[PDB]
């Protein structure tokens, strides 16, 4: 769900250039929801722009944005010429987890047939059964099975039932946010109040951008309960409505994050919030496919470099010394806690399955790793000397947030291991890390994992760094951090052996991927990643179960790969390797390049280099990153739009 | 892989009853799985005994025990009237390890082409190369591949270079074992010391069966290290000892058993039976609870079926005693000398491997509710390799219905070196992990003879919540919940008799999977233990790819997998998670998913909107599991029996 609005106020636009402008931000939002797509603009061919803003046009179409491009485009009564000094349109793309993906339930939703108000809503109204009975009494007729309309359909009630002739829409607005529940997103359009945008929210992003060659008033907007945010001397301005900020950093890097129940309003072109205008530390290449086909490849690809990133300004390999700034105000507290417990969903809390056992080595305290909906079904135990870690690359997924929020309850220390500076998860913990692995718009996370990794290995290395003991294994670990990139570049280096093997195993229905030890997330990442984007039925299976069960689903035509790696449950492997053989299997084994005995017995071996027991995760699941990349490649599918979601679940 | 002998002393028995006896021995353990089989007895044809006690004799073949049996009465040289006094019989059938399935191979394995000696073993010697070549070098020649006949001629060698001519068949067992290195369940035969029989076990089950008509001379035999110290009838001697891997094999003769412990040598001799050590301490005779029933098939064509439709009875046997509906109390018995310590530890750790470690998983909310501890689930297997840090205030379960599990022993050892309190939950009495816990409770589900884990998950599952009810008994606050929860199991026999009387709705199920490669069974909460187990018991049973999914993780992934092809089967029961499974049963519909829904009997709205839907009976919360996880254990049967497979033939090792 991503929301982009475009407000051109005395900066002549025609019709063309406000539509390419509305469609090339929903691209910028795409990843964040492709189901449907949608865009809200004014209607009307008068030469006289002023005679055109008391009608609304909404073209929305079923499909990714591609589909509503083409739908605006080719259109027979819509004059692309029109020039318009003052003008507002809203778009919005949608990820419809419920209902059908139809133009009816996609945004923006309108009030009545004549479209006197329009809105985009991101979230979900907690409420909207309610709010949709009362007003199908006072006469209002729904034709939508979502929350939004509720929204649309409740704006116009407290317009038509207003006590003066000009109650600003900031009035409106905020009468219907005190109708609704849950979070929320809004930015309005309508035909009395034209030009005029309205941005609120509640539990969900919203920032709005500004662009003017003029000079601004002010760098710090006041709230209200030498005033507003507009051009000196002149009047020409450019906002942009934005749920993120990669669909604002290609026209400016002046945005302004709104807060929960400010209500925004750009009222004749001047900004005024209701009830900070910072610089986005963000560059365009950063959110730039560059020369790879798709954002995946190149986060994959560009792993080397956010390793880097991850450990720029934190790790010291000259005197092997580990700094976290974000933990510098609370490691000692950390340390008088008794236990740690780390909290996310899917590939988040792999990178904490991957980390359990070395954070158990070296801090020495108990380590107990938990999905966030299983941990909030259960009503988790939670102490005030427990240490709790959230992994979150958006910093916005709701059962991760919702952790969060319970383990704060219940007077636990809160650590943040977030990739998305002021997201929900980053300003509620109480401290963190921001992993600096850059932003990842591919649905499918690669960089973010290792990065997740490398992070949570860096707060293990501080927790040790007093033990005389510890010395010697924090100096491997280290060295092999310095090593670790390059390494990485040599796995890449396989991608041609691997894309052979995926001509292997592309047509088959099923693959168990098995491991133990450092490398049982290796085969639950490998697993979670061929499901998403190639849709073959991949299950990672811990090595030391075979012989319980789920062996004997192994024989000659059911593909394995096996992950055997010198670490010191070598031989435990060896013995599982020898059991799928046994029951005639031919597995695939990832395997140590030096590991000759592995190397001679296996016809198929990805061979990885050798790094420190409690690294080789990293290195081990980048072949299975690239395997299903190449996977779905072959069966024809997209590796950035993968099937039935999207990325960042931020809501339940 | 099983061991049964025969030991009459003063009992006459003729040679016919003898082999009879073996023979069906042999059967109560061919449920382990086997290839090959054998006996070993006196041989000769002599009227009247003792002139025959220097012809051991052997019958061993490749197969079942059938044809064993069938060979036993094919030798016309062998007189079966022949009468003995006193007489010992070994048998044995065998799990190829170290050889292939043949003749030579079977066991007992002899020290000679005269049959001296011979031994039968349950185990591997691990060191049996550098025996091997020893004796060899000492001029013994090996006839066969398997690791066992490095025992028989090592036994022989021992007797080769005695220094007396009187040195006791115990010692130069004792002298053995010092050379074996591995597994091992053993006993022992020879001519040059007739009637008597030596038994030994190291990290390999082995007991000892009793029976007679006299007074015993005692309950708990001491322990002799290196006669009111050993086991006898007083004032008779007419005796029958039963040595045997698996007490299926002597229960329908005598429920009187001594369990043996490692390095133990036990010897029989002049009918009188002594423990002897290395190394006050003794071994006790205890009396069995099992009946000859409990592992017979019945009128089931299968012990899957039966182990599955008689799940209303073992979950009664589970809580007999232990369970009192009028007054509201729970007491395990095994728990009285240690309830008041385990309220003291700060931490739960329940550690177990396979199905054994699902029932951990769906009783784990229970646990942190009733007793507000943390509650750790552990993989026994990932337990070990990461080091758990375990300390002197957790208390770890071990649940494991053998008591033999490797990964989960060594678990169990690992947190008794770092002083945790650690108790058990099993199946098995005189199992390793029975035994070796400071505690526990026997589940009493009987035993379990089918391939997969059936009344034994329920059994675990009702004993953890009977031990959840016992950790809060002193709480205001929770009586009305302990009362809820134990009037659900004041009805959960009749709920799962419900359940299985929708048998037919569940093969019309298995019929539309029948041609399926894949299904995914999604839940949360109270029910992501039953989509484990469904999964894996239709994985064990069916050999077809079944997944569990955690129902909120769909959109963090798996969810890219449904689509109208890809079989789905949800668990959605009337709980605090309904609203959750609703909204992701939602998600799966929109992606053109159909999937099989098992819900409440009366959960109108979601049985309209779904086609096929399994409707069981409502239950407590913290009980539902039982009755969601039974139709899929009925499932995983059909399908088998479906596709032709044998749902009592193991397919993996
Ligand atoms: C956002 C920011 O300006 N970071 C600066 C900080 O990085 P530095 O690495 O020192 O700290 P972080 O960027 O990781 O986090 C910034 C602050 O947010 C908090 N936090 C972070 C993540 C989370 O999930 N929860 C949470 O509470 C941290 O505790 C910390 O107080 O010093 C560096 C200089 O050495 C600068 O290069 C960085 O620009
Ligand atoms: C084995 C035995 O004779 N049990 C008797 C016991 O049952 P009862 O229910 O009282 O106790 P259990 O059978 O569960 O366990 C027996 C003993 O073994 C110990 N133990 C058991 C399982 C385990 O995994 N770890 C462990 O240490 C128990 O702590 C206990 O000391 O009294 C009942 C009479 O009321 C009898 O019907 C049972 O025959
Ligand atoms: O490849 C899968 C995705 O990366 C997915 O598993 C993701 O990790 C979660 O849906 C939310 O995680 P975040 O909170 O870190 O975004
Ligand atoms: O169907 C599952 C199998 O029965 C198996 O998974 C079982 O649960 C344990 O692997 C055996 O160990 P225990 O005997 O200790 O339960
Ligand atoms: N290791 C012995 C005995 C195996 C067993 O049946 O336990 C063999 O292979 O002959
Ligand atoms: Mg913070
Ligand atoms: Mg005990």
């Known amino acids: 769900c991503g929301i982009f609005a475009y407000l051109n106020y005395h900066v002549p636009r025609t019709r063309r250039e406000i539509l390419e402008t509305l ?77 059908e993906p139809s133009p009816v339930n996609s945004h923006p939703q309108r009030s009545d047939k004549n479209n006197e108000f329009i809105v985009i809503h991101n979230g979900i109204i907690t409420n909207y059964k309610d709010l949709k009975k009362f007003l199908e009494s006072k006469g209002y007729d729904f034709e939508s099975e979502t929350d939004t309309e509720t929204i649309a359909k409740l704006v116009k009630y407290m317009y038509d039932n207003r006590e003066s002739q000009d109650t600003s829409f900031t009035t409106l607005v905020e009468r219907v946010i005190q109708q609704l529940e849950g979070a929320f997103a809004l930015v309005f359009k309508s035909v009395h109040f034209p030009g005029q945008a309205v941005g609120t929210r509640r539990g969900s992003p919203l920032l709005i951008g500004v662009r003017s060659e003029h000079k601004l008033s002010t760098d710090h907007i006041p ?63 950063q959110i730039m496919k560059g020369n790879f086909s798709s954002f995946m490849q190149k986060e994959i690809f560009e792993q080397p470099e956010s390793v880097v990133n991850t450990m720029r300004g934190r790790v010291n390999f000259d ?147 007093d033990r005389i003991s510890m010395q010697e294994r924090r100096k491997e670990i280290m060295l092999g951090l310095k090593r670790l990139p390059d390494l990485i570049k040599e796995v890449l280096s396989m991608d041609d052996e691997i894309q052979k093997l995926a001509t292997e195993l592309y047509h088959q229905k099923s693959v168990l991927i098995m491991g133990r030890g450092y490398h049982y997330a290796t085969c639950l990442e490998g697993a979670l990643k061929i499901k998403e984007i190639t ?97 779905a490649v072959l069966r024809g599918y997209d590796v950035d739009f993968p099937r039935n979601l999207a990325k960042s679940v931020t809501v339940e």
């Open 535 to 631: 849709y073959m039925h991949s299950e990672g299976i811990l090595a030391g179960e075979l012989k319980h069960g789920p062996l004997a689903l192994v024989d000659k035509l059911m593909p394995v790969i096996m992950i055997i790696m010198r670490d010191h449950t070598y031989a435990k492997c060896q013995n599982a390797l020898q059991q799928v053989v046994a029951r005639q299997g031919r597995p695939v084994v990832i395997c140590d390049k030096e590991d000759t005995e592995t190397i001679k017995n296996t016809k198929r071996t990805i061979k990885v280099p050798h790094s420190v027991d409690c690294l080789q995760g990293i290195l081990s699941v980048i072949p299975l990153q690239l395997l299903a990349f190449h996977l």
């Open 223 to 285: 709230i209200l309960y030498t005033t507003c945010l507009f051009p000196v001397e002149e009047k020409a301005v450019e906002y942009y409505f934005a749920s993120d900020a990669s669909a604002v950093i290609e026209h400016t890097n002046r945005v302004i994050f709104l807060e929960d129940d400010d209500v925004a309003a750009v009222v004749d072109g001047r900004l005024s919030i209701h009830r900070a205008v910072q610089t986005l530390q963000m560059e365009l290449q």
């Open 319 to 465: 005197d092997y010394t580990v700094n976290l700034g974000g933990l510098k105000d609370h490691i000692k507290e950390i340390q008088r806690c008794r236990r740690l417990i780390l909290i996310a969903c899917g590939t988040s809390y792999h990178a904490g399955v991957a980390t359990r056992q070395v954070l158990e080595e070296l801090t020495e305290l108990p380590v107990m790793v938990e999905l966030a909906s299983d941990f909030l079904d259960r009503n988790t135990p939670v102490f005030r000397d427990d240490v709790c870690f959230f992994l979150s690359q958006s910093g916005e997924t709701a059962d991760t947030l919702m952790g969060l929020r319970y383990c704060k309850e219940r007077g636990a220390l809160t650590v943040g291991i977030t990739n998305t500076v002021g997201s929900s998860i980053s300003r509620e913990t109480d401290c963190g890390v921001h992993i600096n692995a850059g932003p990842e718009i591919g649905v499918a996370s690669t960089k973010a994992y290792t990065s997740q990794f490398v992070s949570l290995v860096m707060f293990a290395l501080m927790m040790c760094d």
């Open 23 to 99: 469609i090339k931000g929903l691209q910028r939002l795409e990843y964040r929801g492709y189901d449907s797509a949608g865009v809200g603009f004014d209607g009307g061919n008068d030469k006289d722009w002023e005679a055109n803003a008391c009608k609304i046009q909404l073209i929305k179409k079923k499909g990714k944005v591609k589909a509503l491009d083409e739908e605006v485009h080719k259109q027979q009564d819509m004059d692309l010429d029109i020039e318009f000094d003052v003008h507002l349109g809203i778009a919005h793309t949608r990820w419809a987890t419920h209902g």
